[PDB]
Amino acid sequence: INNTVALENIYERIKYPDDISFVENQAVTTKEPIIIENVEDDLARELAFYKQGVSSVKAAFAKLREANVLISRPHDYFAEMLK
Amino acid sequence: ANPRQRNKQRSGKPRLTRRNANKKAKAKIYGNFVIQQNWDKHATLRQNYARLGLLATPNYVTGGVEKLYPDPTLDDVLDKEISIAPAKTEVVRQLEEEAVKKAARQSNKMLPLSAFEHAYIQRLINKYGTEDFESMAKDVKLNSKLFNGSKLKNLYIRMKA
Amino acid sequence: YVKTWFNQPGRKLRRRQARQTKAAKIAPRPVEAIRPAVKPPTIRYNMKVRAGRGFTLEELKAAGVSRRVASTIGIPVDHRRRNRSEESLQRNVERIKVYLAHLIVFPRKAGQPKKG
Amino acid sequence: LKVPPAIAQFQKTLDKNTATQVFKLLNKYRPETAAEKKQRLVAEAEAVANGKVSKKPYNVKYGLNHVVALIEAKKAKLVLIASDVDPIELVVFLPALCKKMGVPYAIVKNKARLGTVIHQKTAAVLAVTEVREEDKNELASIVSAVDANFSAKYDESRRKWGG
Amino acid sequence: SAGFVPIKQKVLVLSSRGVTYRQRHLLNDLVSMMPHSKKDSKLDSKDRLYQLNELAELYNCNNIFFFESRRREDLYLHIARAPNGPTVKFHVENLHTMDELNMTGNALKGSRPILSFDKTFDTAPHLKVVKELLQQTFGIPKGARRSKPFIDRVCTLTIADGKIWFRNYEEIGPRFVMTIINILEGSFGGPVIYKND
Amino acid sequence: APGLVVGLNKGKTLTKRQLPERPSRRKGHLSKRTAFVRSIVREVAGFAPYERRVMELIRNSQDKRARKLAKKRLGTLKRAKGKIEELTSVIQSSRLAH
Amino acid sequence: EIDAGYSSDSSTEFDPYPDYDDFFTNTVRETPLSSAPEPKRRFAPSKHEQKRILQLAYAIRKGRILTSEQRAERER
Amino acid sequence: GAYKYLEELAKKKQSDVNLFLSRVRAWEYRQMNVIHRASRPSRPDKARRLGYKAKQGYVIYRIRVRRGRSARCTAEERVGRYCSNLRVLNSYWVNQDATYKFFEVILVDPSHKAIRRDPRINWIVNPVHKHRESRGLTSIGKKSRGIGKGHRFWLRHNTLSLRRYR
RNA sequence: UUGACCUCAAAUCAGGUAGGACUACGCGCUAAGCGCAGGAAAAGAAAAUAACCAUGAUUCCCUCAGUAACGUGAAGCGGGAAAAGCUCAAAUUUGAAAUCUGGCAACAUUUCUUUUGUUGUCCGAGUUGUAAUUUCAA
RNA sequence: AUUGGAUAUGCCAUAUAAAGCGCUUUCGAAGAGUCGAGUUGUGCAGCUCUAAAUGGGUGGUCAUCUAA
RNA sequence: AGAGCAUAGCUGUUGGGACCCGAAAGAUGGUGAACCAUCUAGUAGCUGGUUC
């Protein structure tokens, strides 16, 4: 099993268009792997996830400001919350 | 304690005392007569069966048995015909013979014919013979009840005796 | 609530007398019916042989006891069980054959009408 | 309300003359009463007791299950359905079943008239499967009238919602 | 015709007979998480999975989310692309629902979240497919109905000890241990091409 | 001897048997009489209000809408597929004689 | 493929008295509905009355039932 | 014969034939008492498969229950108290509308000699069968308490079993 | 003008039956309240388990097992006690409603002049279905 | 003195009957406001909708059952 | 180159009313125009007591 050639072809065929905007794509997949080797422990995993989320948030906020996407939630604009 | 029970203590009427408390009382053997005449009313049914030469269980026993004395293939299991088994005791021998003799007394399973049956089969026989039962069945003028050749054969075979 | 077992020996005795009563009624014939030998249904116990419920219809056909006369001589019939292997068939066909070897069935009175 | 076509088809029954002719033929094939049948059996029983072959009877067939099985056997030559069965579902399929299986049928007035024929209080349906050779013409003439006066007539009215 | 006002992504969420309160509430949360999920009724058949494309075609969904609760004990999630596409079977354990007290997050319904993926997904071609399928599904497409232009959550997936940890941050509340079981090349069919081992 | 042995083991030699099929497994087999009865009653009883809606949607070649109604009506795609196939056959049979 | 579109009536955001339609009885069935073989009993004198005749004869022999001649002469 | 046709017709309940009858019969049923005697079952096929025989000793009673315990369970109990000299055999849904659910109850006369002498229905004469509906011993009573065979279906738990030798 | 059937009534008509009490144990509805039984009740001859060399209604006991599952808390298997299987609906008896309650008249019979039947006859029930046959093991 | 089930035997016995198991160039019916689906309250119940015929249920395409 | 298993006793400890008595409630079902009977041995960090 594990047909690498077939899997790569499927991934390329179903690959999303990278030309989409960062806000539109909403993807923050970077190149530096923020993955703690001690992720089995709760503290190391939480720190690695928080660092990845912080970098993702900063990149998204910068892209949103560049793309004129008002990421700041307005208090006046009331909508049903997820929770 | 209860008011119904004080009702009886405070009344001179006697109780419905019934004296049917017999412990160590074993049940007496009705059913058979040969077994009744060879039953030790003290011994257990296991002991009584074993002494009589019978089996109380055809299966296993779920406990240790009483020891009183220091005693010192498909085609083969399908077409085999076991020739009964010997009768270890005389009581089992007595049961065996009376059953064989009782079969001899009630051994006439064969039936006689009647007036209606005899005339029915005879009338069919005179016209068709005593060997062609298939053609006998296919006749409807004489075989009004519409018996098949197998019921006509039994009538013919039964008429002789 | 506590279930107390002070009647453990009074139950033991009552069950013996029920056996004694059952014999007194049908004393020439066994107090229990015969049972087949079946293999328990798991990887843990399939190497044991234990008593089953009744004999299959393939087992009775092969032995020679029709399913109607089987019960009348104390041979239980389990219609649910079947014979997926020949070992179970021949193991229990032989069991019926041995039981019939030792069987003394007492004749019954049969109606014999005078006419035809 | 608006009556469905399968329930409205019972309001257009068989007319005066044809029903009278139909019941005239039925009354020549009435079944045999309980009081008479006993008399016929004791006559035959007495004959066999003192000292001792017959012919198949000829009577109209009744009973819902019996008749429906006779239609599906393609045995019924004429099926006569009461028009006032209290649960109508008991006969609601009989006209369509007779159409499917090629049997002449008619919806006649009152279960009691069918009931009277067979010495019962009520009959839901009656079927004629076999008649004596003497009356083959009479049954053929009646069936032609039923076709002309019941099946040829209405016809469209049974496909239209009633009421 | 083929479809009016075609939104890029739609999600079909189902469950099998033998589902539980912890499992159903998980299904409800994911359905409420994204607005282009078409919540549907159970699938009485657990045998002919080939009919799943018929539900997707009928309901105009391209992403299929099927919940299989074997022994009503373990949750198996299949994610597939309706037109052909690869079917991926997943394992879900360590259930945490919206009633738990460790919950402290609160996002906005319809707000498009930011997709953050572990870099190990780029190490293996099958992990690339799994990562690719996840972003096209969790990522709410533009123009989705009942979707808000705001952003209030970020989904984080980290592959720890061979098991993906899907955590949503404002912790939003959805908590489970994402484990890959195997991968089917076709839509709930075809020969198996990858075993996670 | 007429007794049973309990426990131990038995010859592991195996010989499989091909058992015939049980009459209880015959359930679900359509009959000629039951097919006839169900077709008669299908005609006589008429159609449900939702079955009429489905047949008219099939008539105008709105199959996607027809399946959406039947699946919402009955409650499963499996039931919808059978209902659509049965009503489509009715449409063809009626269209022959209509 | 799928195009993930939305139907014109997607939830994500007529002759009420028709004439009878003969799609099944428009053609007549030629053959019986049952293939069960005919029993012999229908071609033979009934066994019901033969059972009844025999138990009427027994009562006549035992005098439980007044014979037709005896009953008729008793009416006079 | 025709009982097969009756049951396949009963399956189609929104059908034109059945819908018209359900509306019409619901009207006539509402014009009567809540519990009234029926001359004959309105679905003779359902009564027959549930146990009704057309002989003296068997009784059919029609009852209406307010729609929205089980209504079918409540139909059996209320008819059981009305005809208290009868045992309830079974019960079947016949009709319904927006307000009422209509049920028909099969009851047998335990004191009738035709029932007392039929070995097939003899069993209901025995006093252990008084008020089977009052004890959840009918078809819908058994289902209501989840009585059945399978994995879908109290003294034994809480007790401390202290044996003689322990 | 008559009759048949249908539906609804009446009778201090004939024959029945229900209620209330007990309630240790049973079964329900909702400890208590409410309903209903028996000498036991309930359950019960698989729309049951399993994945094996397969088992075989129900109930109970031991064990499984304080295990699995989600502090709660089993069940399959295994050991034992007891073992018993069946009845209909759905297929025309159709060469014959073969079925049954009741009245009347005899006869027999009794835990019993108190009980319970038999035979004959007449009415009624029933063909909108009472018997026989059949129950998937077929 | 009341009765159990048996045994021996007498008299009756409507057998022109009723069965079991051999075979098949013939047939073989199987329970619906239910199952199922959606949603609420405590599997069950309410309410909306409402089926099928190698079907349906329940387990691991196979096995196993055959509800109302 | 296995030391465990069972039974009994003492000791500790955990849960059962749990060393004894003593606490303001409330619930279900009734009586009289609050009362009564169960739940109830309700809730204990506490009080008083606890035998050669």
GROMACS .gro file of C-alpha atoms in nm, chain B residues 23 25-30 32 35 39 45 49 55-56 58-60 73-74 77-78 80 82 84-85 96 98-99 102-103 106 108-109 111-114 117, chain C residues 13 16-17 19-21 23-35 51 86 90 93-95 97 99 101-102 104 106-107 109-110 112 114-116:
model
   76
  106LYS     CA    1  -3.927  -3.560   5.690
  108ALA     CA    2  -4.025  -3.946   5.385
  109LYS     CA    3  -3.961  -4.077   5.034
  110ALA     CA    4  -4.228  -4.109   4.768
  111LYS     CA    5  -4.373  -4.455   4.718
  112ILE     CA    6  -4.352  -4.609   4.372
  113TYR     CA    7  -4.676  -4.632   4.182
  115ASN     CA    8  -4.476  -4.979   3.754
  118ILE     CA    9  -4.037  -5.176   4.004
  122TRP     CA   10  -3.797  -5.109   4.553
  128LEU     CA   11  -3.362  -4.352   4.374
  132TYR     CA   12  -3.214  -4.770   4.008
  138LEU     CA   13  -3.014  -4.597   3.450
  139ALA     CA   14  -3.140  -4.300   3.649
  141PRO     CA   15  -2.853  -4.123   3.054
  142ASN     CA   16  -2.627  -3.818   3.092
  143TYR     CA   17  -2.345  -3.747   3.334
  156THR     CA   18  -1.554  -4.255   1.095
  157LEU     CA   19  -1.868  -4.140   0.916
  160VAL     CA   20  -2.096  -4.478   1.315
  161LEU     CA   21  -2.391  -4.441   1.075
  163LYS     CA   22  -2.375  -4.984   1.248
  165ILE     CA   23  -2.617  -5.234   1.779
  167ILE     CA   24  -2.948  -5.435   2.201
  168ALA     CA   25  -2.758  -5.496   2.526
  179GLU     CA   26  -3.765  -5.733   2.904
  181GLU     CA   27  -4.298  -5.922   2.987
  182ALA     CA   28  -4.263  -5.649   2.723
  185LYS     CA   29  -4.706  -5.835   2.589
  186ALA     CA   30  -4.613  -5.762   2.228
  189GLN     CA   31  -5.115  -5.759   2.110
  191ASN     CA   32  -5.231  -5.870   1.541
  192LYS     CA   33  -5.188  -5.522   1.399
  194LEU     CA   34  -5.688  -5.539   0.995
  195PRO     CA   35  -5.975  -5.742   0.847
  196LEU     CA   36  -6.189  -5.607   0.566
  197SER     CA   37  -6.552  -5.498   0.584
  200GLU     CA   38  -6.438  -5.254   0.134
  257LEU     CA   39  -3.383  -3.157   5.024
  260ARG     CA   40  -3.425  -3.441   4.602
  261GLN     CA   41  -3.787  -3.514   4.688
  263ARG     CA   42  -3.663  -3.609   4.193
  264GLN     CA   43  -3.804  -3.882   4.416
  265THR     CA   44  -4.159  -3.773   4.330
  267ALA     CA   45  -3.937  -4.121   3.975
  268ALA     CA   46  -4.232  -4.253   4.178
  269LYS     CA   47  -4.446  -4.138   3.885
  270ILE     CA   48  -4.232  -4.276   3.602
  271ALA     CA   49  -3.999  -4.508   3.790
  272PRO     CA   50  -3.898  -4.755   3.526
  273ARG     CA   51  -3.766  -4.472   3.307
  274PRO     CA   52  -3.485  -4.227   3.377
  275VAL     CA   53  -3.545  -3.920   3.587
  276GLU     CA   54  -3.374  -3.707   3.321
  277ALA     CA   55  -3.396  -3.706   2.943
  278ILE     CA   56  -3.096  -3.777   2.726
  279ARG     CA   57  -2.898  -3.485   2.583
  295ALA     CA   58  -2.438  -3.135   2.707
  330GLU     CA   59  -1.969  -3.428   1.012
  334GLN     CA   60  -2.161  -3.874   1.381
  337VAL     CA   61  -2.592  -4.012   1.579
  338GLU     CA   62  -2.387  -4.268   1.774
  339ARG     CA   63  -2.525  -4.123   2.098
  341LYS     CA   64  -2.782  -4.539   1.867
  343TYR     CA   65  -2.942  -4.492   2.386
  345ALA     CA   66  -2.950  -5.002   2.233
  346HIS     CA   67  -3.043  -4.992   2.602
  348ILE     CA   68  -3.688  -5.122   2.657
  350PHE     CA   69  -4.323  -5.122   2.683
  351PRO     CA   70  -4.610  -5.195   2.442
  353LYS     CA   71  -5.293  -5.100   2.413
  354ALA     CA   72  -5.411  -5.031   2.058
  356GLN     CA   73  -5.886  -5.288   1.740
  358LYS     CA   74  -6.439  -5.536   1.538
  359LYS     CA   75  -6.539  -5.447   1.182
  360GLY     CA   76  -6.313  -5.363   0.888
   0.00000   0.00000   0.00000
